[PDB]
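Holo prediction. Input below; ligand is chloride ion.
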Amino acid sequence: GKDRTEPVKGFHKAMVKTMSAALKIPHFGYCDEVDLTELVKLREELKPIAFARGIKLSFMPFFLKAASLGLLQFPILNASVDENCQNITYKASHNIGIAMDTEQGLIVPNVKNVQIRSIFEIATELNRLQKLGSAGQLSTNDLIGGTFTLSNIGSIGGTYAKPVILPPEVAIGALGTIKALPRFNEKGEVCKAQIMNVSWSADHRIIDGATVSRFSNLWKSYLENPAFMLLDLK
Amino acid sequence: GKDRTEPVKGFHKAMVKTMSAALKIPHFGYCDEVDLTELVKLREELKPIAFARGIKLSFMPFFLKAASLGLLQFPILNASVDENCQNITYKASHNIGIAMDTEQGLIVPNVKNVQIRSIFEIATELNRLQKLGSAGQLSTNDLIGGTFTLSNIGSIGGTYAKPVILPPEVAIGALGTIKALPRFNEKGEVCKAQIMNVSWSADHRIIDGATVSRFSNLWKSYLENPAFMLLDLK
Amino acid sequence: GKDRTEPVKGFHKAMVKTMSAALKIPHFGYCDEVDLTELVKLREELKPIAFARGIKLSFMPFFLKAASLGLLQFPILNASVDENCQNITYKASHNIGIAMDTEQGLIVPNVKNVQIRSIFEIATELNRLQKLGSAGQLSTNDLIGGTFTLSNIGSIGGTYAKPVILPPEVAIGALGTIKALPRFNEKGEVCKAQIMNVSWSADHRIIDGATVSRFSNLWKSYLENPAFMLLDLK
Amino acid sequence: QGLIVPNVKNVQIRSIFEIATELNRLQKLGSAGQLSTNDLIGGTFTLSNIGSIGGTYAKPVILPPEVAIGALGTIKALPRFNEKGEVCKAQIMNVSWSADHRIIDGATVSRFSNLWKSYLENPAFMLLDLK
Ligand SMILES: [Cl-]
Ligand SMILES: [Cl-]
Ligand SMILES: [Cl-]
Ligand SMILES: [Cl-]
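Structure of the complex:
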């Protein structure tokens, strides 16, 4: 009923620091829509196997592995840049951050080395990370050395977004809500289509539009055609 | 057919200072689409009552009232931050700004204390502010004290936008054109649906994604199911 | 399996500087969807007239001509602004840049003087700049003097975007993929509509939302109903 | 020149694509009499694709010192039921396994078989544990 004034205190101080650092990066935005009908089908048929192993299976393992596969072809997106963007460090480890909000807001644990993990290992690893993170009990090692971030705004709502890049990373994407929409198929009839939006932000100092673009189509094509993923997994 | 160079004079000076000031804010964008069918119909039936009362009823009063109702639960979106985001002031009054362009550039009057005003009063205050705005007769009190801003780009066209937060506020939303699109209902059939897109921008130093998202959901449910609002209004 | 640090060098340093000089610009984002169904048809008809004159014809020359017509109406969008935004230079020529990525990064050649060129001469100029651009032989004069920029992200993929304004310009558009979507027609029946998304960013210091939105609308009606262009050309 | 059984090394660590590559080569090699000792030795397990000429079921001969072999027949389109009770075009391929009954028992070939088949009938399940 009156104005209350307060200090930005405790943990909230870190978000201020991070997002201010983020103003030094000219964000380029590139968004698209991805047809997840196959993937949803795919997932429904994998839930029984993962449940039988003690693991809930979201879409995220899929998204994460596809980005990993994507970053093999476009390593620049898994890089870091220095104080005034004079030097680029290309990172070997695909340590993808899963953006989370807690009772304390922004916290970004990462799955280490997705490049050598199975979809199933990543499920397992996300499951550990939520258990811990909602328990307020996420460790330092889980929190450092991220190379690239995904953020599932769609777990709550949303179509497109403009996510903020997390220094020293050069990219992030946001995934919206999976939604049934009327869409045409090869036959030209109106199908139910399981449609999701993705928004990528990138540091346009060193990552051009074609690279985000091309990365995005590859990532996307792994998800629309999940067999495409089968070809290069070991 | 030659290049003309001109001073930015007078009133145009202030947009320069307002927008440059917004460079210090790290903008997180979050977007959605809102199904306004029930609201379009709802407006048709109220239109004759408000015309009888002498008011023109647009969608804004509803957006505004749904925003305020939303800000009761996410009061941090109706707040301010200081020079370096050290201290947040949570504002009790919902003084929601409405952006306009005038011959003289950007002007943003606000409706005071929406938290204690009915949709109909809001309608009235809008017409008052619109008349005045376009007559160049807005008072100082009409302009000062804004706590949150809506921007109806949809009066002209557009789907999504990236609106610019107005210091010292922490959030702004842009509303796009109402468009009839084909969408599924519960029975899985193709419908006429009135769809509006909304774009929020938020100061990500103190507002996190969940906050902006859950707010958007809540706001969004008040409008897609108008009668939800009716529960807590006195 | 190893990290690698390399410097940003030579022909890459330039993208660093450009994109960093864009951080001084408060970017306003406005987006829309265009119905390109009549243009696709129209393009089909002209294709065997261009092939017979040596010219590949895409959509870009239409986009260029429709932007130039827009700019005659809204000359402030083909304008420049000084060191701290205190003078506007309104620019006669519509030198419109086409944003390209090379095996060399970001290159932005422009078509000089679109306001005095036919769609055909525009097509001719685009072809030329593509032969030269993809062979890394663009001259200095093709490179300098741009007043306004369009960027065809959609030759690769994408829906909406946040393009980064190139100083000293004040605006830029990005065009998405032309995608066949189900849409209602006049009679309220479900049609195959060729839908493209467009995304403009504009220097909000001197450009208000009204002008970006009205410009868009004009641009968009030239493309949705191409006869309108006919009316005024010589 | 008769029976020649080269082998793909270390399948457990190679991708499908990698394996298609190594077969392409093994074939160019074999069908010119130019497989090396290394291509030829060290086999742990054998498949036999009789279906490239024709056939349904078979009784292939385990190659000592290995303990199992499988033959794959032709892929024919056959009428089969789906979940819903309707008559569809199904591609049915027969497999025949022979196993050294001294140390391999019936359940093992069975379950193995089921699994292999499982991965093939539902090619997506292969996704889960590949990396
Ligand atoms: Cl920017
Ligand atoms: Cl930012
Ligand atoms: Cl900004
Ligand atoms: Cl749509």
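Helices of chain B lie at 12-22, 37-52, 60-73, 119-135, 140-143, 209-224. That is the main takeaway for now.
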